[PDB]
Amino acid sequence: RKQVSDGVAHIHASFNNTIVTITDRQGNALGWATAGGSGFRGSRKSTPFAAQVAAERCADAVKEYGIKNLEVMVKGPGPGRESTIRALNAAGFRITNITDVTPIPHNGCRPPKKRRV
RNA sequence: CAAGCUUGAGUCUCGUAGAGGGGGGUAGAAUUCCAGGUGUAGCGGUGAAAUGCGUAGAGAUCUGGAGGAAUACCGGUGGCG
């Protein structure tokens, strides 16, 4: 029901999960996939493979809007930075930018206790 | 006890470095919450789970606002006390 042309892949790479979210150039979200959505719990949720499928499962969900190009913003540490920025290429978009937008405090807020494990 | 001396101890002159102390302003990043827009089924968490949050629209994403605390990089068997 629409055109957009130019979008923005926001990949959010926690340790437990990845969320890819494709959005247009001014913030408004079109589609999203998670690792947990793609049939993966627990150990397998995390992995760089189930980051991939996340990408696809999302590049599938924006045939409708008929995107050609996107920028990739990457927010976080985890596995599926490197994998997910490759599975948006090979599922048939052009990649203009790749950004790292990971929050670093300029010493700010006290984190939680060390784990004893 | 008296009289000295200048090397110990001090005073003055001029400079240099410094997270030394006390009071007053101010900057940017981040977390949390609040009010919106886009959006849809999960999120979060773990060794693996559940309790927990979510179709009363969460998480993701963008805009605006509040507030408190701490000051990335510099940063160093560097420095001051």
Side-chain angles (χ1 to χ4, degrees), chain A residues 6-109:
Chain A
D6 288 274
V8 183
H10 281 106
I11 89 81
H12 175 91
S14 19
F15 282 106
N16 303 330
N17 213 29
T18 64
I19 300 133
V20 192
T21 275
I22 305 305
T23 194
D24 82 321
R25 297 267 295 99
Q26 312 88 25
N28 302 261
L30 317 185
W32 58 266
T34 59
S38 322
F40 289 90
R41 306 309 307 167
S43 176
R44 315 209 278 101
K45 215 175 163 182
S46 69
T47 46
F49 180 76
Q52 249 159 225
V53 315
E56 309 152 67
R57 214 120 68 86
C58 195
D60 171 67
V62 296
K63 294 181 204 310
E64 303 303 273
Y65 296 71
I67 298 142
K68 302 213 293 297
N69 314 313
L70 30 76
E71 304 175 57
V72 191
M73 280 168 61
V74 168
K75 178 178 275 143
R81 303 153 56 86
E82 187 192 309
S83 115
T84 218
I85 305 196
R86 207 194 310 275
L88 292 162
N89 186 61
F93 297 129
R94 201 197 180 177
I95 307 293
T96 2
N97 280 69
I98 322 179
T99 347
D100 202 350
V101 299
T102 310
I104 308 310
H106 296 347
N107 262 43
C109 245

